[PDB]
């Protein structure tokens, strides 16, 4: 078997008896009534047993050495399953495989029983998860802090071509990886009012909610380091949530506890979109308030807070945890009694902010009346922060009255609001973009005024992905052939993949790389019929676009191409075309009407195309249901063509693109986000770039975008639009897609037509190359061998050195 | 050390390493940061490990042999802590004591960390718990079925002398004894409507709620038998509780899941009182519906249902689970398609009902409009049952038109209601009282008409208590001296306690029995200052009345006596009186105003009495806070005088009375419930009986009860009443107790004054005896030696033989 570790004689024996121990004592089952679910749990507990020893010494280590601690605050941690990832990082995979085999079980079958920890929406949440893995692997004293939602991202179901949402009860059968820590339970305050006394302000008459922490282990790759992800759960106190007497009902008071506990009930399913709901704000203050108390308690142990920034670094994943700035001030000033200026100095030096998008509708602008009611003291602090900041601006740009209102954290208008992004820049010593282009756009556009005031704050940290889960775990076959030639060191040193460049003309390697891709495609094609049922051709080109459904991601542009391919086949049926299986997957936020309309269009196209006999097996349109982390681990290694076609300037970075490049897929996309640095790394000749550049989009906006023009000059595009309008794709409901057509023609913010011609032309070139297996594979080797830069180990090493001020280390912790 | 088992060399070593295993692997802690709570859990898991082996073979045994199964349906199971009880029944107590000692820990300190499983209100729920223990010890294939409330009986707090209720979050830190079984999850239906088709009725358009079972082990006493208590948890389905589309909000739909799950949220805190709330009815159908499906699934394995009663017996603990009758019919007729008559025959033969009270306000009469909306099909079945039953009556008593309406399950009037007790008698082959007197009263009064129709159905089964928890566990000192003389066989054969009669004149025994009582009192007096703080004299007579607060229990009569004692001391200060510490404890249902007023009176009396310098240490009035199972295990072994003073004919049986008799306390009470059989067993000369007999109460009711008469002829009583009226006990609020005085004088349903004179006279006699240690102790020996009849092992053996048709067995199951 592969390099999934050694199957030692002693360790396979030990594993088996512990598997049985747990099956008996933990699951209280006996082989004759054990269900596959019991077997999965016995294995999970047996594997978990192996890292508790290390988890304890790692945490004890940090206490003795007392290094600077990194706190990663995010309202999202898109973890996925954790059994395999743990076996991988512990080098237990083969041993476990062997042991379960001897017990007469199929490890892979058991792995599929684990539920995904879908506590994220998409890119932002998966980044945090990749980051955690890298911070552990780089030996950093880091903690991931978040919310333990009992309901993660909803499970997607397609009914009659429409998306149906359903509760993700991932904790239903229990979570063997987490461990409640009811000793560090903390109180969080809401509402109340502010009393201004003789020696300071006081936050009074507040409603209390308890925050109970649950720790989940985060093992580093083969270095015996296990860090911690602490997730908070909301709990109602037993007193006031019953003790506030004078009629109401005792039963009612108890049932009403599910009101304070609703704070950690569900994740908001919005990807790159802001919904100003009170419940959201409560979740945001909740994770911040609890986390800070825990951070300060740890520090008090390790009261001059001058050294606080020297021992603490808190990273803000977007503006979601932005209340950490005025909350740190509140504690330091109101509770610790530090003077404002000393408190502010400490706050700025420990906080750092990460921006993830430039679209306006994703920007967090909280109505003042909301903050005023829920967090009265924080609003006072934000006004004071704003006051002192604007004074800094006025002093720097005398008379620039327009700049003053532009930079204010407080936005005037219909209803006053607080611009959380402005708050973050002001109270952080570093603000970074997630890709070189996005970072530049921040300085030139969105945060130009802030950049002019404090240029030193703005940085860039291109995103990355973990090679462990995103290669070794999901593509062992590819990882193995690579290791056969260059060794195993690249797993934690992805740059070494360049060495593969010298095998680009190797006849054996070219044959292998192509073989694993073929095996991956056959396995996925099988999985497709197994769990979803309705055949696909594994000899075709696997054209896949998987990511959340958005207008800026242009799944619609992908659709126009698919209809074009179909129309050309119908025109010249007996003409040869490279067979394609185009797979589009992703979830739409429940309230996003357009995004839900697009899913219906995709399935509608498949209904026509997949049953047309003239088309045969040359073209299949498949919608990948319930796209999530575990599903991504299956499609990506099987993809040939990765679709990264967002309008230039809208996708901050993207990370799925990097996942595909590492797994042997060629990329067709625009010069957007990280796509630019990928092409720049692999060479533009090894990339399928097309469409407008940022500059072209701006030029078009200056003159004005008119979709009619494109409709008028391109007969193929016109034909498609008239097909949708006449009900060609929706016979029973001819006007079903009027909203899409109407939008495309009159309010397309992402100029889909503007990139249509260059897109189908470019698609022609990829089909041409696919016709030449040898050259296609050689170009694939050029992408893989050049993907090393996109490992989160590189991203983290940069955050560590340029923002946190800590030195990464690949030193093995002193055994378990 | 005592007979808490052997401290084997091999087993103490084994216990220690497993304690450490769990402390490391399970709690993920290391000795340097382990909290006492961690130590308690490591021990709990280590002890639990010892019975899983037996639990599995016991359940596997029942499958192979396939004996008749006993199902005990109760909405209450007042279990209390379970660590010690498990060690006791497994003979692990000494080993564990030794092992934790060597690990440098105090086992007793750790035992106090366990939370009580207060899933009961009082007597009815504790009976079910004692019964479970006896059924396991007698080797019966029995299952306890109930509801897993996440909030049990509220925790009582006394504020300014008033009771304050607060949520009993007993699951907060986790329950190491239960185990979720998500494989046997079942669906339960609510609402909907009935469609009458060609081949039967159909319950349609129902709302579904899932029932998830959790199994907790019930170990028999040293026989290697471990039965199961299955408790249902309400869970919302992920579909419809989200899938019923067309606007509303996705977030809201998820948050609204806590509406279907509210069914198993909290226990109703009503003791002997009926509240017709919809939530209550839902809990009742929920536990019945789930339990029956599980019962039938087990049977289908083991379709002629003729043998159903031969393999199944379901006992109804009161009328709470009474829907089991029309629900069994529904399944058999609607689903299994059996003819009515065959279905009814089977139903009657498998069901048996237990009555627990005769007070009208405790009787379950559900409004028809409620059943009509929530369970439409069941209402139809109940009407059909009623129809056929009344036809039986008319045929037996031709022309007796008044008897017809008296016996109807349907009560006419303001709003129609369903008399659940009538339903139970009609559909059960056996109906029993819980004490000889109560059982007779059922036949002569309440169910006279039913008794005349089917005399063969009515039986008696006097309650009992388990000698394991109620002696060996709480009073090891007494258990030991008894065992020193007669051996250990009496623990599972309480009748052998009679042998102690021959030591009644033994000088050594008399000295020992008195010594353990003195040690018990010193320990309790210490515990009092430890956890509640404010001293008591251990040389005084411990006068205790602990049970739920009720008007029928007459805590008020106890109060009049206490005030009398105080008034006599104030009259003749320098006269000698036997010192007394009277302790009154118990919870009042939150909506029971009078019961809450009584708690305030008790604390008010203590405020006056406990601070009067002339009184000194001769009289202390203490209110025992948060009385519960674990607290009972502490006070009872320390009591000298047990107060069982309910008005004759109101306390069906009582069980606390039996607990006191077994632990060396003398009883002062009325000829009520089981008090009659206790005096009859010990000899009336060894009991302190007083007051009216049932007959006297009736005579008084014939002529008419006038409290003024007693007030007029007894100067001491008059003085007390004028003290309460003038504010002697409530200075700041002089009229604070007007409701109590008003009630006593004008609407006393339990004639407190009528028994006053005979009560204080009788109290004089106990004080006289207490002055003679030797004789007091000799009378105590006569009570203990004669308590054997009140063991639940005797009660169960009788249910088994006279109702269930199974033979108890004390055979050790083939080792673990
Ligand atoms: C019930 C049972 C078992 N039962 C458990 O392991 N386990 C449990 O019943 C069990 C499971 C969970 C919990 Cl919390 C408590 C218990 Cl006691 C094992 C073997 C067996 O014989 C199989 C013969 C071959 C066959 O026919 O399959 C039977 C009958
Ligand atoms: C943190 C820690 C430990 N820590 C754990 O056992 N356990 C945990 O930290 C721990 C607890 C629960 C979970 Cl879910 C996960 C972990 Cl990793 C042990 C010893 C120690 O040194 C004590 C020196 C003497 C003293 O000064 O007490 C330190 C520092
Ligand atoms: C990597 C990942 C994402 C991010 O994909 P993009 O294409 O960058 O938007 C979203 N969802 C899942 C399941 C992922 O694995
Ligand atoms: C035994 C018991 C009861 C029943 O007491 P009675 O005096 O029969 O009403 C009630 N509560 C607890 C805690 C018990 O242990």
mmCIF file of N, CA, C and O in Angstrom, chain A residues 432-500:
data_model
loop_
_atom_site.group_PDB
_atom_site.id
_atom_site.type_symbol
_atom_site.label_atom_id
_atom_site.label_comp_id
_atom_site.label_asym_id
_atom_site.label_seq_id
_atom_site.Cartn_x
_atom_site.Cartn_y
_atom_site.Cartn_z
ATOM 1 N N UNK A 432 -5.005 43.475 5.755
ATOM 2 C CA UNK A 432 -4.508 42.783 4.573
ATOM 3 C C UNK A 432 -5.566 42.293 3.599
ATOM 4 O O UNK A 432 -6.708 42.029 3.972
ATOM 5 N N UNK A 433 -5.161 42.200 2.335
ATOM 6 C CA UNK A 433 -6.024 41.702 1.282
ATOM 7 C C UNK A 433 -5.672 40.227 1.181
ATOM 8 O O UNK A 433 -4.677 39.787 1.767
ATOM 9 N N UNK A 434 -6.459 39.456 0.437
ATOM 10 C CA UNK A 434 -6.223 38.020 0.334
ATOM 11 C C UNK A 434 -5.595 37.544 -0.985
ATOM 12 O O UNK A 434 -5.438 36.345 -1.229
ATOM 13 N N UNK A 435 -5.227 38.501 -1.823
ATOM 14 C CA UNK A 435 -4.562 38.218 -3.091
ATOM 15 C C UNK A 435 -3.956 39.541 -3.535
ATOM 16 O O UNK A 435 -4.492 40.609 -3.225
ATOM 17 N N UNK A 436 -2.829 39.479 -4.242
ATOM 18 C CA UNK A 436 -2.156 40.693 -4.697
ATOM 19 C C UNK A 436 -3.069 41.700 -5.383
ATOM 20 O O UNK A 436 -3.028 42.882 -5.063
ATOM 21 N N UNK A 437 -3.903 41.245 -6.310
ATOM 22 C CA UNK A 437 -4.793 42.164 -7.010
ATOM 23 C C UNK A 437 -5.844 42.798 -6.099
ATOM 24 O O UNK A 437 -6.111 43.998 -6.187
ATOM 25 N N UNK A 438 -6.435 41.984 -5.224
ATOM 26 C CA UNK A 438 -7.449 42.439 -4.277
ATOM 27 C C UNK A 438 -6.814 43.450 -3.322
ATOM 28 O O UNK A 438 -7.404 44.488 -3.014
ATOM 29 N N UNK A 439 -5.606 43.144 -2.858
ATOM 30 C CA UNK A 439 -4.903 44.036 -1.955
ATOM 31 C C UNK A 439 -4.621 45.392 -2.599
ATOM 32 O O UNK A 439 -4.669 46.425 -1.935
ATOM 33 N N UNK A 440 -4.321 45.388 -3.895
ATOM 34 C CA UNK A 440 -4.046 46.631 -4.605
ATOM 35 C C UNK A 440 -5.319 47.444 -4.766
ATOM 36 O O UNK A 440 -5.323 48.660 -4.608
ATOM 37 N N UNK A 441 -6.404 46.748 -5.076
ATOM 38 C CA UNK A 441 -7.706 47.372 -5.242
ATOM 39 C C UNK A 441 -8.152 48.053 -3.940
ATOM 40 O O UNK A 441 -8.852 49.069 -3.975
ATOM 41 N N UNK A 442 -7.759 47.491 -2.793
ATOM 42 C CA UNK A 442 -8.129 48.070 -1.497
ATOM 43 C C UNK A 442 -7.475 49.429 -1.330
ATOM 44 O O UNK A 442 -8.108 50.380 -0.873
ATOM 45 N N UNK A 443 -6.201 49.501 -1.702
ATOM 46 C CA UNK A 443 -5.412 50.725 -1.604
ATOM 47 C C UNK A 443 -5.801 51.788 -2.619
ATOM 48 O O UNK A 443 -5.769 52.980 -2.321
ATOM 49 N N UNK A 444 -6.152 51.349 -3.823
ATOM 50 C CA UNK A 444 -6.526 52.261 -4.897
ATOM 51 C C UNK A 444 -7.980 52.692 -4.843
ATOM 52 O O UNK A 444 -8.316 53.808 -5.222
ATOM 53 N N UNK A 445 -8.848 51.807 -4.375
ATOM 54 C CA UNK A 445 -10.267 52.115 -4.336
ATOM 55 C C UNK A 445 -10.905 52.236 -2.958
ATOM 56 O O UNK A 445 -10.838 53.282 -2.314
ATOM 57 N N UNK A 446 -11.530 51.144 -2.531
ATOM 58 C CA UNK A 446 -12.247 51.052 -1.270
ATOM 59 C C UNK A 446 -11.634 51.757 -0.046
ATOM 60 O O UNK A 446 -12.302 52.579 0.575
ATOM 61 N N UNK A 447 -10.375 51.479 0.287
ATOM 62 C CA UNK A 447 -9.758 52.102 1.455
ATOM 63 C C UNK A 447 -8.647 53.101 1.145
ATOM 64 O O UNK A 447 -7.723 53.286 1.930
ATOM 65 N N UNK A 448 -8.756 53.755 -0.002
ATOM 66 C CA UNK A 448 -7.780 54.747 -0.444
ATOM 67 C C UNK A 448 -7.455 55.824 0.603
ATOM 68 O O UNK A 448 -6.287 56.101 0.884
ATOM 69 N N UNK A 449 -8.486 56.438 1.173
ATOM 70 C CA UNK A 449 -8.293 57.474 2.184
ATOM 71 C C UNK A 449 -7.539 56.971 3.405
ATOM 72 O O UNK A 449 -6.752 57.706 3.993
ATOM 73 N N UNK A 450 -7.800 55.724 3.793
ATOM 74 C CA UNK A 450 -7.153 55.107 4.950
ATOM 75 C C UNK A 450 -5.710 54.782 4.625
ATOM 76 O O UNK A 450 -4.822 54.906 5.467
ATOM 77 N N UNK A 451 -5.483 54.369 3.387
ATOM 78 C CA UNK A 451 -4.141 54.054 2.930
ATOM 79 C C UNK A 451 -3.296 55.339 2.918
ATOM 80 O O UNK A 451 -2.116 55.315 3.275
ATOM 81 N N UNK A 452 -3.898 56.458 2.520
ATOM 82 C CA UNK A 452 -3.177 57.730 2.481
ATOM 83 C C UNK A 452 -2.793 58.202 3.880
ATOM 84 O O UNK A 452 -1.738 58.797 4.068
ATOM 85 N N UNK A 453 -3.655 57.926 4.859
ATOM 86 C CA UNK A 453 -3.420 58.306 6.255
ATOM 87 C C UNK A 453 -2.346 57.436 6.912
ATOM 88 O O UNK A 453 -1.427 57.945 7.538
ATOM 89 N N UNK A 454 -2.470 56.119 6.769
ATOM 90 C CA UNK A 454 -1.510 55.185 7.360
ATOM 91 C C UNK A 454 -1.135 54.086 6.373
ATOM 92 O O UNK A 454 -1.647 52.973 6.440
ATOM 93 N N UNK A 455 -0.222 54.387 5.442
ATOM 94 C CA UNK A 455 0.209 53.406 4.440
ATOM 95 C C UNK A 455 0.820 52.134 5.018
ATOM 96 O O UNK A 455 0.658 51.048 4.471
ATOM 97 N N UNK A 456 1.520 52.284 6.133
ATOM 98 C CA UNK A 456 2.187 51.172 6.801
ATOM 99 C C UNK A 456 1.268 50.031 7.270
ATOM 100 O O UNK A 456 1.728 48.911 7.477
ATOM 101 N N UNK A 457 -0.022 50.307 7.435
ATOM 102 C CA UNK A 457 -0.975 49.293 7.896
ATOM 103 C C UNK A 457 -1.354 48.261 6.846
ATOM 104 O O UNK A 457 -1.580 47.096 7.173
ATOM 105 N N UNK A 458 -1.427 48.693 5.589
ATOM 106 C CA UNK A 458 -1.850 47.823 4.500
ATOM 107 C C UNK A 458 -0.821 46.846 3.975
ATOM 108 O O UNK A 458 0.298 47.225 3.633
ATOM 109 N N UNK A 459 -1.228 45.576 3.934
ATOM 110 C CA UNK A 459 -0.392 44.472 3.470
ATOM 111 C C UNK A 459 -1.180 43.506 2.607
ATOM 112 O O UNK A 459 -2.369 43.682 2.367
ATOM 113 N N UNK A 460 -0.495 42.464 2.165
ATOM 114 C CA UNK A 460 -1.127 41.435 1.378
ATOM 115 C C UNK A 460 -0.672 40.109 1.914
ATOM 116 O O UNK A 460 0.456 39.985 2.388
ATOM 117 N N UNK A 461 -1.561 39.124 1.853
ATOM 118 C CA UNK A 461 -1.252 37.771 2.289
ATOM 119 C C UNK A 461 -2.130 36.925 1.402
ATOM 120 O O UNK A 461 -3.305 36.738 1.690
ATOM 121 N N UNK A 462 -1.567 36.441 0.303
ATOM 122 C CA UNK A 462 -2.331 35.626 -0.627
ATOM 123 C C UNK A 462 -2.750 34.356 0.083
ATOM 124 O O UNK A 462 -1.950 33.724 0.774
ATOM 125 N N UNK A 463 -4.013 33.994 -0.102
ATOM 126 C CA UNK A 463 -4.582 32.804 0.507
ATOM 127 C C UNK A 463 -3.844 31.566 0.039
ATOM 128 O O UNK A 463 -2.993 31.618 -0.847
ATOM 129 N N UNK A 464 -4.191 30.445 0.647
ATOM 130 C CA UNK A 464 -3.581 29.185 0.299
ATOM 131 C C UNK A 464 -4.483 28.095 0.834
ATOM 132 O O UNK A 464 -5.506 28.382 1.453
ATOM 133 N N UNK A 465 -4.104 26.848 0.592
ATOM 134 C CA UNK A 465 -4.872 25.706 1.041
ATOM 135 C C UNK A 465 -3.898 24.716 1.664
ATOM 136 O O UNK A 465 -2.702 24.762 1.398
ATOM 137 N N UNK A 466 -4.400 23.827 2.513
ATOM 138 C CA UNK A 466 -3.524 22.846 3.131
ATOM 139 C C UNK A 466 -3.318 21.644 2.216
ATOM 140 O O UNK A 466 -4.273 21.027 1.728
ATOM 141 N N UNK A 467 -2.051 21.324 1.936
ATOM 142 C CA UNK A 467 -1.731 20.187 1.074
ATOM 143 C C UNK A 467 -2.085 18.835 1.701
ATOM 144 O O UNK A 467 -2.183 17.825 0.994
ATOM 145 N N UNK A 468 -2.288 18.816 3.019
ATOM 146 C CA UNK A 468 -2.637 17.581 3.706
ATOM 147 C C UNK A 468 -4.031 17.138 3.320
ATOM 148 O O UNK A 468 -4.204 16.088 2.709
ATOM 149 N N UNK A 469 -5.040 17.923 3.667
ATOM 150 C CA UNK A 469 -6.393 17.539 3.300
ATOM 151 C C UNK A 469 -6.606 17.642 1.798
ATOM 152 O O UNK A 469 -7.240 16.780 1.200
ATOM 153 N N UNK A 470 -6.061 18.690 1.186
ATOM 154 C CA UNK A 470 -6.263 18.917 -0.236
ATOM 155 C C UNK A 470 -5.384 18.189 -1.265
ATOM 156 O O UNK A 470 -5.408 18.506 -2.452
ATOM 157 N N UNK A 471 -4.633 17.196 -0.808
ATOM 158 C CA UNK A 471 -3.797 16.397 -1.691
ATOM 159 C C UNK A 471 -3.663 14.988 -1.109
ATOM 160 O O UNK A 471 -4.324 14.058 -1.577
ATOM 161 N N UNK A 472 -2.831 14.835 -0.078
ATOM 162 C CA UNK A 472 -2.620 13.531 0.553
ATOM 163 C C UNK A 472 -3.918 12.820 0.934
ATOM 164 O O UNK A 472 -4.078 11.623 0.692
ATOM 165 N N UNK A 473 -4.844 13.558 1.535
ATOM 166 C CA UNK A 473 -6.106 12.983 1.963
ATOM 167 C C UNK A 473 -7.047 12.631 0.820
ATOM 168 O O UNK A 473 -7.534 11.503 0.742
ATOM 169 N N UNK A 474 -7.309 13.590 -0.065
ATOM 170 C CA UNK A 474 -8.229 13.365 -1.179
ATOM 171 C C UNK A 474 -7.628 12.744 -2.436
ATOM 172 O O UNK A 474 -8.351 12.176 -3.255
ATOM 173 N N UNK A 475 -6.315 12.849 -2.592
ATOM 174 C CA UNK A 475 -5.650 12.302 -3.773
ATOM 175 C C UNK A 475 -4.397 11.523 -3.387
ATOM 176 O O UNK A 475 -3.279 11.914 -3.715
ATOM 177 N N UNK A 476 -4.573 10.393 -2.688
ATOM 178 C CA UNK A 476 -3.403 9.608 -2.295
ATOM 179 C C UNK A 476 -2.655 9.072 -3.514
ATOM 180 O O UNK A 476 -1.428 8.982 -3.507
ATOM 181 N N UNK A 477 -3.405 8.726 -4.557
ATOM 182 C CA UNK A 477 -2.801 8.208 -5.774
ATOM 183 C C UNK A 477 -1.807 9.167 -6.398
ATOM 184 O O UNK A 477 -0.728 8.764 -6.812
ATOM 185 N N UNK A 478 -2.169 10.441 -6.460
ATOM 186 C CA UNK A 478 -1.290 11.447 -7.020
ATOM 187 C C UNK A 478 -0.148 11.714 -6.049
ATOM 188 O O UNK A 478 1.011 11.819 -6.456
ATOM 189 N N UNK A 479 -0.470 11.821 -4.765
ATOM 190 C CA UNK A 479 0.552 12.074 -3.753
ATOM 191 C C UNK A 479 1.628 10.995 -3.813
ATOM 192 O O UNK A 479 2.809 11.281 -3.662
ATOM 193 N N UNK A 480 1.210 9.753 -4.038
ATOM 194 C CA UNK A 480 2.140 8.630 -4.098
ATOM 195 C C UNK A 480 3.119 8.697 -5.273
ATOM 196 O O UNK A 480 4.329 8.600 -5.064
ATOM 197 N N UNK A 481 2.620 8.860 -6.501
ATOM 198 C CA UNK A 481 3.519 8.926 -7.651
ATOM 199 C C UNK A 481 4.489 10.102 -7.531
ATOM 200 O O UNK A 481 5.648 10.004 -7.934
ATOM 201 N N UNK A 482 4.028 11.204 -6.952
ATOM 202 C CA UNK A 482 4.899 12.350 -6.756
ATOM 203 C C UNK A 482 6.007 11.952 -5.775
ATOM 204 O O UNK A 482 7.187 12.226 -6.007
ATOM 205 N N UNK A 483 5.618 11.308 -4.676
ATOM 206 C CA UNK A 483 6.565 10.883 -3.648
ATOM 207 C C UNK A 483 7.558 9.836 -4.163
ATOM 208 O O UNK A 483 8.702 9.763 -3.691
ATOM 209 N N UNK A 484 7.116 9.022 -5.121
ATOM 210 C CA UNK A 484 7.974 7.997 -5.714
ATOM 211 C C UNK A 484 9.206 8.649 -6.348
ATOM 212 O O UNK A 484 10.294 8.070 -6.362
ATOM 213 N N UNK A 485 9.021 9.853 -6.875
ATOM 214 C CA UNK A 485 10.098 10.577 -7.529
ATOM 215 C C UNK A 485 10.851 11.578 -6.648
ATOM 216 O O UNK A 485 12.084 11.609 -6.657
ATOM 217 N N UNK A 486 10.130 12.397 -5.889
ATOM 218 C CA UNK A 486 10.799 13.399 -5.073
ATOM 219 C C UNK A 486 10.758 13.244 -3.555
ATOM 220 O O UNK A 486 11.273 14.098 -2.836
ATOM 221 N N UNK A 487 10.168 12.164 -3.051
ATOM 222 C CA UNK A 487 10.122 12.001 -1.611
ATOM 223 C C UNK A 487 8.858 12.547 -0.969
ATOM 224 O O UNK A 487 7.947 13.003 -1.652
ATOM 225 N N UNK A 488 8.825 12.508 0.360
ATOM 226 C CA UNK A 488 7.677 12.951 1.153
ATOM 227 C C UNK A 488 7.794 14.331 1.789
ATOM 228 O O UNK A 488 6.827 14.829 2.366
ATOM 229 N N UNK A 489 8.970 14.938 1.715
ATOM 230 C CA UNK A 489 9.172 16.241 2.337
ATOM 231 C C UNK A 489 8.288 17.370 1.817
ATOM 232 O O UNK A 489 8.053 18.353 2.511
ATOM 233 N N UNK A 490 7.789 17.231 0.599
ATOM 234 C CA UNK A 490 6.953 18.266 0.013
ATOM 235 C C UNK A 490 5.597 18.441 0.692
ATOM 236 O O UNK A 490 4.957 19.483 0.520
ATOM 237 N N UNK A 491 5.153 17.443 1.456
ATOM 238 C CA UNK A 491 3.854 17.544 2.125
ATOM 239 C C UNK A 491 3.792 18.733 3.085
ATOM 240 O O UNK A 491 2.715 19.292 3.314
ATOM 241 N N UNK A 492 4.940 19.107 3.652
ATOM 242 C CA UNK A 492 5.011 20.240 4.573
ATOM 243 C C UNK A 492 5.971 21.289 4.013
ATOM 244 O O UNK A 492 6.390 22.220 4.713
ATOM 245 N N UNK A 493 6.310 21.123 2.738
ATOM 246 C CA UNK A 493 7.203 22.034 2.034
ATOM 247 C C UNK A 493 6.814 21.987 0.563
ATOM 248 O O UNK A 493 7.617 21.592 -0.279
ATOM 249 N N UNK A 494 5.585 22.397 0.266
ATOM 250 C CA UNK A 494 5.049 22.359 -1.092
ATOM 251 C C UNK A 494 5.911 22.950 -2.214
ATOM 252 O O UNK A 494 5.743 22.596 -3.386
ATOM 253 N N UNK A 495 6.822 23.849 -1.871
ATOM 254 C CA UNK A 495 7.670 24.450 -2.891
ATOM 255 C C UNK A 495 8.465 23.385 -3.632
ATOM 256 O O UNK A 495 8.759 23.539 -4.810
ATOM 257 N N UNK A 496 8.794 22.301 -2.940
ATOM 258 C CA UNK A 496 9.556 21.210 -3.530
ATOM 259 C C UNK A 496 8.876 20.560 -4.737
ATOM 260 O O UNK A 496 9.488 19.763 -5.442
ATOM 261 N N UNK A 497 7.616 20.906 -4.979
ATOM 262 C CA UNK A 497 6.879 20.344 -6.104
ATOM 263 C C UNK A 497 7.488 20.775 -7.444
ATOM 264 O O UNK A 497 7.243 20.148 -8.485
ATOM 265 N N UNK A 498 8.287 21.839 -7.407
ATOM 266 C CA UNK A 498 8.956 22.357 -8.599
ATOM 267 C C UNK A 498 9.881 21.302 -9.192
ATOM 268 O O UNK A 498 10.070 21.241 -10.407
ATOM 269 N N UNK A 499 10.466 20.485 -8.319
ATOM 270 C CA UNK A 499 11.366 19.417 -8.735
ATOM 271 C C UNK A 499 10.692 18.534 -9.778
ATOM 272 O O UNK A 499 11.362 17.864 -10.559
ATOM 273 N N UNK A 500 9.362 18.534 -9.783
ATOM 274 C CA UNK A 500 8.598 17.728 -10.723
ATOM 275 C C UNK A 500 8.729 18.273 -12.143
ATOM 276 O O UNK A 500 8.393 17.592 -13.116
#
